[PDB]
């Protein structure tokens, strides 16, 4: 169980900062600050994680959401990251993500970006 | 603003049930019960949504996460749905989703499923 | 084996037309005309399919690519559809797709759209 | 135009080998050998690429498909990679991919894996 491992400040390859607390129950709460896109300052995030992972060297599944609205901007969009926490000398959170924009029904086909972020405790 | 529109009980094409409350602030809280997979009964969900969408007929971006652990099972996985709420006579939540399993670093390549769920207020 | 089942003219939910020949060997060749986006007229497509599927009622895996350049336009992008052919009274090709735009390394994070198309022999 | 840049032997982070020829017209033809999964030896691949990319430092969009059937195995599946070729001292092909298995209509929800491969000319 990785409540301790997860909780803290994480940085991705784009220079984004994800600050999270992991609850005993499975909760994830925090703030996200994106280095790119139509974003400034911190945005609320929430999510979930597996509080009793397999003990066989598997990763810890988890995910979280950011809606890109805060007191400064509203980018009419939401990203969800789905992935796994891997512990040990160089801990990582390896994710894939889906960003959906609010669109008209005619432009729905082009509503959703897909990418992959890797989070580390350093840089 | 679709706090009212979102809040409630939603059903997808697989026969799953998503029960959600949308907060004034952007919060989503609730429970998910999957008709398929390594799942039984209700699982906690949390997420976010755009509480002040565009007024130009665009959808309302949102997302949420379920970690597949509850008092009955632990499937060592998490799904995130990213999508948009569309209001009006036949309201829908149109999503794409990422399901990550906890895996060894050797099997990480096969950790993540992708699909699409459409939620309605009826069936 | 669905060489016969696949070959022909298919229409998706956006009103696009996919014309394909399936070879005995696994080849797919054809043309795609998109109802949406930065596209006009026909574009070359190529792909592959499983020429000896399982006989247990499973679908037939397949995929194909379109690069969005032809004599009329160049949208500096490529879509790949991955999915399965399901035969029988109402045959379908159920796909998920990835559209990558050519971008600068700074905008790479926003290079890739994800969606889902369902192809039928009618409409 | 990157006919020359693309053509050749490429290696990904899993230790897979992708051997490709790029045609003047936009064609990609070749063979793929996977380091992982239900695969052995070479499999046919085909695809497309943008033969006249933007000259503004953008990448070259492209994609390709492998159906996982050859003389040795049939894994009743197909992968499509969608991405972009980036040229220059350390050329890369940055991809995201969708792997669809042939499934029953009941298991269709779990038919499709998503991941990301980065290809280089060395290792």
UniProtKB/Swiss-Prot annotation, chains A, B, C, D:
Residues 3-123 form the Avidin-like domain. The keyword Chaperone does not apply. GO terms for cellular component: extracellular region. Biotin binds at residues 32, 43, 81, 97, 109. It is found in: Secreted. Keywords: Biotin, Secreted, Signal. A motif (Cell attachment site) lies at residues 48-50. One of its GO terms (molecular function) is biotin binding. Homotetramer. The biological function of streptavidin is not known. Forms a strong non-covalent specific complex with biotin (one molecule of biotin per subunit of streptavidin). Belongs to the avidin/streptavidin family. This is Streptavidin. It comes from Streptomyces avidinii. The chain holds residues 38 to 158 of 183 of the full protein.
